[PDB]
Write a protein that binds this DNA or RNA. Structure first.
Ligand SMILES: [Cl-]
Ligand code: NA
Ligand code: NA
Ligand code: NA
Ligand code: NA
Lengths: 460, 216
DNA sequence: GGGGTTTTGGGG
DNA sequence: GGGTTTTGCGG
DNA sequence: GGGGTTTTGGGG
């Protein structure tokens, strides 16, 4: 096998050619008819990656790759831009002025993907390790072979990819539309924004809260199975999106079966600048707290910074598998998300009780301070996406006698029968928590079969 | 102002506890819609979303009569006009019916629909499942949440708070997490079903029986 | 044998 | 090829 | 022609 550079590939031979290249864009593998699937991507290399700079504006130049197949599983799923793909037996031709490489995988063509970063997206999601730097994390056909002479190619192109992504935007301004101008587009368009929030809408759907450099916020649904790599705080490029005119309560983007959500390799200059430039926005949330019925979800809390790198656990596992699953048994501290259906005790004034540390008993303060230290003894009845359909509600406690969850309400424990200020603040919070579309993101600690909230605080 | 007639109709129905009478009257006018599919699933659009109409045994017998030279299962890419229709909420298994969500579905009962054969309709956006729309899924979640909150506040009583001694001072204490599980309602099975709206009931026809009725 | 492809009958 | 399937909540 | 396969020389 001989590998040719993108710009040097023959346009006349019309013979099968092979090459290595960096993927900067790609559609998701999609079906076109009762037998064909396609995946169109944009590729670059040391000989083709930027337009004639002078009046080009530093726009990116690229070649296009079109893979054909009879089965979905025979096409590459590009989750991250910047990775490398090796193709075998591709025919080159000019399509509307650009170098178009066509490869029929259902016949004799094949592809192989190599992680430019230490790990592939899937490997990062599973906290795995790479077999080797010359091992493809995915490929077409039952076999993929790498020769000794390829190592230098792959290793060099990798070095080039990082230099390329760290020096240029790669995804230039001409390759996407600003969110505050999305409504002006006739058809579909591309986006480049930071994921401000990943809200689990249902058993199979994530609702991404996006915000781009224009300051505009948008929401879009992202199937869990299709895009399992979405993460809050990360920057992604969305291939093919449309403005939803039928949504008046919130700005929504519509995606198609061919639409794709792509992240950037660690060295991405664009992603790096956007992660810092674009900052969290709570304007939508703050505005919803004034509505009787908000169609926009509101995460009322924030977990301690130290628990940020902690994966979440659903109520289904927390309450139905925490005593049977080998793994869940080993953990005592968990993070989870849910919405409050009811709060006990009903009387907010009873949320704070007097606690005697010698008898391990608490009591009402409707009869003066002769009971002991003031503590919160609140019992939340919650539910979530994983348990959304069952006839259950789960108990989550906020017992602050030992310090856990003492600052949840941003209101130090006090006699609510006398301190009107504290009572009102807690009464208002009680309304926000039980209101539709209000959710809680918190860290809990398993103690004697119960979960107590800790390192979690309201931000409204 | 809502542009999707189907979305506004279905949303208002859900926001009005399935009470079709309480839904706006200025919306109960004829519905001209493009047919996206006719078999195995009959789906129509309003220029934004697609939904599945449910024909009564009377509806099809009428159609067949007024239009003998026409087959319903072949109305694909054709536009129809529903003059007499209604909306009703029905409990379903969303795992089987894809035109539903959270085991609930708003049905478009078609009593009388005329086929405006060969009428080219203005080019619009690609039709999407209304029951997959963000706002509509949210509207339905609001519905269930309201029913759940009412049922729970009625079922759960007495402030049965976990005794504080069970959590504090429990170094030698061990417990099972299923102790925190509380029944949300007096429901029978394992699925919440304590709703208040009255499930509509109108004998309808499967799109398969009509297929055999036109080409057995 | 059968695809895709063009070899349009025949390699290993 | 900057596109539209059912597997109809990867396609 | 050449794969994977078995058809092990020949179809469409
Ligand atoms: Cl325990
Ligand atoms: Na042959
Ligand atoms: Na041949
Ligand atoms: Na052969
Ligand atoms: Na053979």
């Amino acid at each position: 096998y001989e590998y040719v550079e993108l710009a040097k590939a023959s346009l006349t031979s019309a013979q099968p050619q092979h090459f290595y290249a960096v993927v900067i864009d790609a559609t998701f593998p999609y079906k076109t008819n009762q037998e064909r699937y396609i995946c169109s991507l944009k590729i670059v290399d040391p000989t083709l990656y930027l337009k004639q700079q002078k009046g080009a504006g530093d726009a990116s130049d690229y070649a296009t790759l079109v893979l054909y197949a009879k089965r979905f599983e025979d096409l590459p799923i590009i989750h991250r831009a910047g990775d490398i793909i090796r193709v075998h037996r591709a025919t080159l031709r000019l399509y509307n002025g650009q170098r178009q490489f066509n490869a029929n995988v259902f016949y004799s063509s094949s592809w192989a993907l190599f992680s430019t970063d230490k790990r592939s997206v899937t490997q990062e999601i599973n906290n795995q390790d790479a077999v080797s730097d010359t091992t493809p994390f995915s490929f077409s056909s039952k076999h993929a072979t790498i020769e000794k002479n390829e190592i230098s190619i792959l290793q060099n192109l990798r070095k080039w990819a990082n230099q390329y992504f760290s020096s240029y935007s790669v995804i230039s301004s001409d390759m996407y539309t600003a969110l505050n101008k999305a409504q002006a587009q006739k058809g579909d368009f591309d986006v480049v924004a930071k994921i401000l929030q990943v809200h689990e809408l249902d058993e199979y759907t994530n609702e991404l809260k996006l915000k781009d450099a224009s300051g505009q916020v948008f929401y879009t649904l992202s199937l869990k199975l299709k895009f399992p790599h979405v993460r809050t705080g990360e920057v992604v490029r969305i291939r093919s999106a449309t403005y939803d005119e039928t949504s008046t309560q919130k700005k929504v983007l519509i995606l198609s079966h061919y639409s794709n959500i792509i992240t950037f390799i660690q060295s991405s200059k664009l992603a790096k600048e956007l992660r810092a430039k674009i900052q969290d926005d709570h304007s939508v949330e703050v505005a919803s707290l004034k509505k009787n019925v908000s169609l926009n979800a509101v995460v009322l809390t924030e977990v301690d910074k130290k628990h940020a790198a902690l994966p979440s656990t659903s109520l289904q596992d927390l309450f139905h598998h925490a005593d049977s699953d080998k793994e869940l048994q080993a953990q005592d501290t968990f993070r989870t998300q849910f919405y409050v259906t009811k709060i006990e005790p009903s009387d907010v004034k009873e949320w704070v009780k007097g606690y005697d540390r010698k008898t391990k008993k608490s009591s009402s303060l409707k009869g003066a301070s002769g009971k002991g230290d003031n503590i919160f003894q609140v019992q939340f009845l919650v539910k979530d996406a994983s348990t959304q359909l069952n006839n259950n509600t789960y108990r989550v406690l906020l017992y602050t006698q030992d310090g856990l969850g003492a600052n949840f309400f941003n209101v130090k424990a006090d006699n609510l029968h006398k301190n009107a200020d504290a009572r009102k603040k807690l009464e208002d919070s009680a309304e926000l928590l039980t209101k539709f579309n209000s959710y809680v993101d918190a860290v809990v600690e398993r103690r004697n079969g119960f979960y107590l909230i800790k390192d979690t605080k309201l931000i409204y | 102002q809502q542009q999707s007639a189907f979305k506004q109709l279905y949303t208002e129905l859900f926001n009005n506890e399935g009470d079709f009478s309480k839904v706006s009257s200025n919306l109960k006018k004829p519905l001209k819609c493009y047919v996206k599919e006719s078999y195995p699933h009959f789906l129509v659009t309003d220029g934004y979303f697609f939904v599945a109409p449910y024909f009564t045994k009377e509806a099809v017998n009428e159609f067949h009569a007024k239009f003998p030279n026409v087959n319903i299962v072949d109305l694909t890419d054709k536009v129809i006009v529903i003059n007499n229709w209604s909306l009703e909420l029905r409990r379903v298994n969303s795992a089987e019916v894809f035109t539903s969500y959270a085991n609930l579905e708003a049905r478009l009962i078609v009593h009388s629909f005329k086929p405006n054969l060969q009428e080219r309709l203005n080019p619009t956006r690609y039709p999407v499942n209304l029951f997959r729309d963000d706002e509509f899924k949210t509207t339905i979640q609001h519905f269930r949440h309201t029913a759940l909150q009412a049922a729970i506040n009625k079922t759960v009583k007495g402030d049965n708070l976990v005794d504080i001694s069970k959590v504090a001072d429990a170094a030698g204490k061990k417990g099972k997490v299923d102790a925190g599980i509380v029944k949300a309602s007096a429901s029978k099975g394992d699925e919440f079903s304590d709703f208040s709206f009255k499930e509509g009931n109108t004998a309808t026809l499967k799109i398969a029986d009509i297929f055999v009725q036109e080409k057995g």
